[PDB]
Write an enzyme that holds these catalytic residues in place. Sequence first.
Site, PDB file in Angstrom:
ATOM      1  CG  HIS A  96     -12.651   5.558  -8.275  1.00  0.00           C
ATOM      2  ND1 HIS A  96     -11.416   6.717  -7.591  1.00  0.00           N
ATOM      3  CD2 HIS A  96     -13.194   4.944  -8.324  1.00  0.00           C
ATOM      4  CE1 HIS A  96     -10.278   5.890  -7.983  1.00  0.00           C
ATOM      5  NE2 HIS A  96     -11.266   4.892  -8.622  1.00  0.00           N
ATOM      6  CB  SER A 154      -9.167   5.345 -11.287  1.00  0.00           C
ATOM      7  OG  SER A 154      -8.112   4.640 -10.559  1.00  0.00           O
ATOM      8  CG  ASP A 175     -10.456   8.242  -5.263  1.00  0.00           C
ATOM      9  OD1 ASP A 175     -10.697   9.498  -5.985  1.00  0.00           O
ATOM     10  OD2 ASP A 175     -10.357   7.580  -4.725  1.00  0.00           O
TER      11      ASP A 175
HETATM   12  O1  LIG Z   1      -8.393   2.883  -9.235  1.00  0.00           O
HETATM   13  C1  LIG Z   1      -8.109   3.008  -8.103  1.00  0.00           C
HETATM   14  C2  LIG Z   1      -6.360   3.343  -8.106  1.00  0.00           C
HETATM   15  C3  LIG Z   1      -6.070   3.747  -7.518  1.00  0.00           C
HETATM   16  N1  LIG Z   1      -4.273   3.889  -7.249  1.00  0.00           N
HETATM   17  C4  LIG Z   1      -3.846   4.511  -7.334  1.00  0.00           C
HETATM   18  C5  LIG Z   1      -2.749   4.351  -7.631  1.00  0.00           C
HETATM   19  C6  LIG Z   1      -1.531   5.258  -7.706  1.00  0.00           C
HETATM   20  C7  LIG Z   1      -1.160   4.831  -6.134  1.00  0.00           C
HETATM   21 CL1  LIG Z   1      -0.054   5.520  -5.072  1.00  0.00          CL
HETATM   22  C8  LIG Z   1      -2.257   4.375  -4.788  1.00  0.00           C
HETATM   23  C9  LIG Z   1      -3.281   4.472  -5.682  1.00  0.00           C
HETATM   24  N2  LIG Z   1      -4.570   2.947  -8.768  1.00  0.00           N
HETATM   25  N3  LIG Z   1      -5.976   2.321  -9.109  1.00  0.00           N
END
Ligand SMILES: OCc1cn(-c2ccc(Cl)cc2)nn1
Length: 355
Positions: free
Chosen positions: A301, A145, A253
């Site tokens: 996920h 993630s 996702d």
């Molecule tokens: O655990 C879900 C999650 C999604 N994101 C995330 C990170 C970078 C971008 Cl660019 C978009 C979403 N971080 N954590």
Amino acid sequence: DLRLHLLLNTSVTCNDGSPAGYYLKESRGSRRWLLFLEGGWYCFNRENCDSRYDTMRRLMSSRDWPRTRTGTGILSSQPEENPYWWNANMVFIPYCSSDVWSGASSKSEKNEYAFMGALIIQEVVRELLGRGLSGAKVLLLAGSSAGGTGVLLNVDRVAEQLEKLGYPAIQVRGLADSGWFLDNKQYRHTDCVDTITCAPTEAIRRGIRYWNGVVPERCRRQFQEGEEWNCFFGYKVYPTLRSPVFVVQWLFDEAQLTVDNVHLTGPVQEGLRLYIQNLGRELRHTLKDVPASFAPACLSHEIIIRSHWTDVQVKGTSLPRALHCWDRSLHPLKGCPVHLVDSCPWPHCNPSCPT
Ligand SMILES: OCc1cn(-c2ccc(Cl)cc2)nn1
Ligand SMILES: *[C@@H]1O[C@H](CO)[C@@H](O)[C@H](O)[C@H]1NC(C)=O
């Protein structure tokens, strides 16, 4: 079990000023080291970081962390659960900086919170060199993630850090799980005026300012000031990297669908059918020239630290097997593939998808 160590350098902190840390389980007969980055979204202004501190405080502070944690999936030491690297030295780095592992800012009279994700990784690497990492042959930086995006942002900096410290023989590699996102159009639109409606491109642009965010040099030089948010998107930052990186990404996702404002409850219709099929095809297209990749056609996920990560297969090959084939390729191999991307166009057209 992995045992907690809080960082000896107390200037490297979680959001609230408490010391950051890592969980470690040594394997003295091994020269392989696995450093895993936890995930869990992010926060990008005072108001939404305050909310996160009320109900997600373990992602913001070490004061309530337990003394040990059980290794699961790729962090398991049992061959039955982890056919790939069961004998490696195991490290779990908790995510307590809310900055997609990019920050380099301390708490101060100017800043209510510290955002030090990039410095936490560098300090963990430094303190581990005194605990056996100095003898490693391979350091695999993995994450899920936000931690998967963190691999893309930090793997080359770990490589440069070890080179300048006198360890040119340690091979640094990356494993990015569920961190390969698209800056695509939402299925339904929302104007960024508070957290709910603010698309990733805008939230990350504000985040980099709020965090004093850092991105890899080559990517930074391409996109330049004010546009570094581009380097948080895998298909844009990956081509600038030099360390070998294996990419694990569900084609559908759940976090991608969340930021696209898609909510699947129930009888789709034509508009949403076309949107979902086009998202799968776009993801597939961004991986066409990624030689080490694993991308099944599932709505899910994360995977690599889940206990049942051994069950999913692409074209008859499991993820632990593909990772082993990757290891061999870094010494095409007959019957031991490394590029595995589903071609069928709908969630769960692959029968091995997680239930
Ligand atoms: O655990 C879900 C999650 C999604 N994101 C995330 C990170 C970078 C971008 Cl660019 C978009 C979403 N971080 N954590
Ligand atoms: C502690 O960490 C800070 C932030 O990365 C760094 O500037 C400083 O040199 C470190 N001190 C020691 C003794 O490692």
